[PDB]
Write a protein that holds these residues in place. Structure first.
Motif, PDB file in Angstrom:
ATOM      1  N   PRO A  35     -31.217 -58.802  55.395  1.00  0.00           N
ATOM      2  CA  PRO A  35     -31.762 -58.948  54.554  1.00  0.00           C
ATOM      3  C   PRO A  35     -30.591 -58.740  53.386  1.00  0.00           C
ATOM      4  O   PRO A  35     -29.726 -57.471  53.327  1.00  0.00           O
ATOM      5  CB  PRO A  35     -32.951 -57.803  54.030  1.00  0.00           C
ATOM      6  CG  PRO A  35     -33.236 -57.803  54.773  1.00  0.00           C
ATOM      7  CD  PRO A  35     -32.454 -57.953  55.948  1.00  0.00           C
ATOM      8  N   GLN A  36     -30.121 -59.090  52.479  1.00  0.00           N
ATOM      9  CA  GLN A  36     -29.472 -59.003  51.148  1.00  0.00           C
ATOM     10  C   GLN A  36     -29.430 -58.653  49.946  1.00  0.00           C
ATOM     11  O   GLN A  36     -29.990 -59.546  49.163  1.00  0.00           O
ATOM     12  CB  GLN A  36     -28.424 -60.645  51.313  1.00  0.00           C
ATOM     13  CG  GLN A  36     -27.940 -61.444  52.582  1.00  0.00           C
ATOM     14  CD  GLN A  36     -27.276 -61.864  52.621  1.00  0.00           C
ATOM     15  OE1 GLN A  36     -26.809 -62.913  51.806  1.00  0.00           O
ATOM     16  NE2 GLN A  36     -26.786 -62.632  54.356  1.00  0.00           N
ATOM     17  N   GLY A  37     -28.296 -57.814  49.220  1.00  0.00           N
ATOM     18  CA  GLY A  37     -28.746 -57.727  47.846  1.00  0.00           C
ATOM     19  C   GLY A  37     -27.495 -58.273  46.896  1.00  0.00           C
ATOM     20  O   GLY A  37     -26.549 -58.876  47.235  1.00  0.00           O
ATOM     21  N   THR A  38     -27.166 -57.270  45.825  1.00  0.00           N
ATOM     22  CA  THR A  38     -26.937 -57.940  44.535  1.00  0.00           C
ATOM     23  C   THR A  38     -26.149 -56.678  43.923  1.00  0.00           C
ATOM     24  O   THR A  38     -26.549 -55.763  45.323  1.00  0.00           O
ATOM     25  CB  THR A  38     -27.619 -58.386  43.410  1.00  0.00           C
ATOM     26  OG1 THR A  38     -26.184 -59.039  42.722  1.00  0.00           O
ATOM     27  CG2 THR A  38     -28.203 -57.048  42.492  1.00  0.00           C
ATOM     28  N   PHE A  39     -25.403 -56.752  43.350  1.00  0.00           N
ATOM     29  CA  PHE A  39     -24.524 -54.930  42.899  1.00  0.00           C
ATOM     30  C   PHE A  39     -24.664 -54.962  41.143  1.00  0.00           C
ATOM     31  O   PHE A  39     -24.275 -56.113  41.072  1.00  0.00           O
ATOM     32  CB  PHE A  39     -23.390 -55.854  43.260  1.00  0.00           C
ATOM     33  CG  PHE A  39     -22.505 -54.507  43.089  1.00  0.00           C
ATOM     34  CD1 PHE A  39     -22.632 -53.513  43.821  1.00  0.00           C
ATOM     35  CD2 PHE A  39     -21.330 -54.863  42.322  1.00  0.00           C
ATOM     36  CE1 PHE A  39     -21.074 -52.182  43.970  1.00  0.00           C
ATOM     37  CE2 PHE A  39     -20.227 -53.561  42.391  1.00  0.00           C
ATOM     38  CZ  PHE A  39     -20.556 -52.280  42.353  1.00  0.00           C
ATOM     39  N   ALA A  40     -24.966 -54.120  41.706  1.00  0.00           N
ATOM     40  CA  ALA A  40     -25.001 -53.763  39.260  1.00  0.00           C
ATOM     41  C   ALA A  40     -24.690 -53.065  38.743  1.00  0.00           C
ATOM     42  O   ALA A  40     -24.957 -52.450  37.664  1.00  0.00           O
ATOM     43  CB  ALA A  40     -25.698 -54.381  38.535  1.00  0.00           C
ATOM     44  N   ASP A  41     -23.469 -51.959  39.251  1.00  0.00           N
ATOM     45  CA  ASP A  41     -23.104 -50.379  38.553  1.00  0.00           C
ATOM     46  C   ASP A  41     -23.918 -49.687  38.248  1.00  0.00           C
ATOM     47  O   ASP A  41     -24.663 -49.322  37.424  1.00  0.00           O
ATOM     48  CB  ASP A  41     -22.103 -50.823  37.304  1.00  0.00           C
ATOM     49  CG  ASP A  41     -21.486 -49.717  36.697  1.00  0.00           C
ATOM     50  OD1 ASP A  41     -21.613 -48.963  37.180  1.00  0.00           O
ATOM     51  OD2 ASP A  41     -21.502 -49.482  35.270  1.00  0.00           O
ATOM     52  N   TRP A  42     -25.060 -49.443  38.825  1.00  0.00           N
ATOM     53  CA  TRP A  42     -25.980 -49.087  39.075  1.00  0.00           C
ATOM     54  C   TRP A  42     -25.933 -47.617  38.130  1.00  0.00           C
ATOM     55  O   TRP A  42     -27.120 -46.468  38.008  1.00  0.00           O
ATOM     56  CB  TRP A  42     -26.743 -48.513  40.597  1.00  0.00           C
ATOM     57  CG  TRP A  42     -26.750 -49.716  41.075  1.00  0.00           C
ATOM     58  CD1 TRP A  42     -25.873 -49.701  42.769  1.00  0.00           C
ATOM     59  CD2 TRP A  42     -27.758 -50.839  40.832  1.00  0.00           C
ATOM     60  NE1 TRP A  42     -26.365 -50.907  42.824  1.00  0.00           N
ATOM     61  CE2 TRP A  42     -26.957 -52.030  42.226  1.00  0.00           C
ATOM     62  CE3 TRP A  42     -28.395 -50.689  40.576  1.00  0.00           C
ATOM     63  CZ2 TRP A  42     -28.217 -52.751  42.219  1.00  0.00           C
ATOM     64  CZ3 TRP A  42     -29.171 -52.480  40.517  1.00  0.00           C
ATOM     65  CH2 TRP A  42     -28.496 -53.215  41.601  1.00  0.00           C
ATOM     66  N   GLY A  43     -24.965 -47.213  37.908  1.00  0.00           N
ATOM     67  CA  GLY A  43     -24.661 -45.355  37.407  1.00  0.00           C
ATOM     68  C   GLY A  43     -24.806 -45.691  35.644  1.00  0.00           C
ATOM     69  O   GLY A  43     -23.712 -44.966  34.964  1.00  0.00           O
TER      70      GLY A  43
END
Lengths: 49, 50
Positions: A35-43
């Motif tokens: 499974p592959q996710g995304t990336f989005a500066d969670w902080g």
């Protein structure tokens, strides 16, 4: 009954040649999916003011 | 200090808000610290398929 040598060779060849085809197909499907996710500066944070 | 004023009714209002805020945050600590388990289960069950 008399059997022709030429007719038999063709049947034997086809029966065995179809085995080679599967051994070759087996060379591609060698691994499971991950499974592959995304990336989005969670902080990211905004002031309560 | 914290024991002495617990349920006393005697703190100045600027500290009353600050401490009440810190107590509310304990529910965030509970959720946040479950990440280590979620991480382990993910690896064994979804990456390794076991």
């Amino acid at each position: 009954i008399n059997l022709n040598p030429v007719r038999v060779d063709n049947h034997k060849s086809k029966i065995l040649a179809s085995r080679l085809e599967n051994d070759l197909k087996a060379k591609d499907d060698l691994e499971p999916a991950i499974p592959q996710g995304t990336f989005a500066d969670w902080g990211e944070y905004s002031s309560i003011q | 200090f914290l024991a002495a004023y617990d349920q006393s009714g005697k703190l100045t209002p600027h500290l009353t808000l600050f401490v009440s805020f810190l107590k509310l945050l304990e529910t965030s600590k509970k959720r946040f610290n479950q990440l280590t388990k979620r991480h382990l289960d993910f690896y064994y069950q979804e990456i390794l398929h076991l």
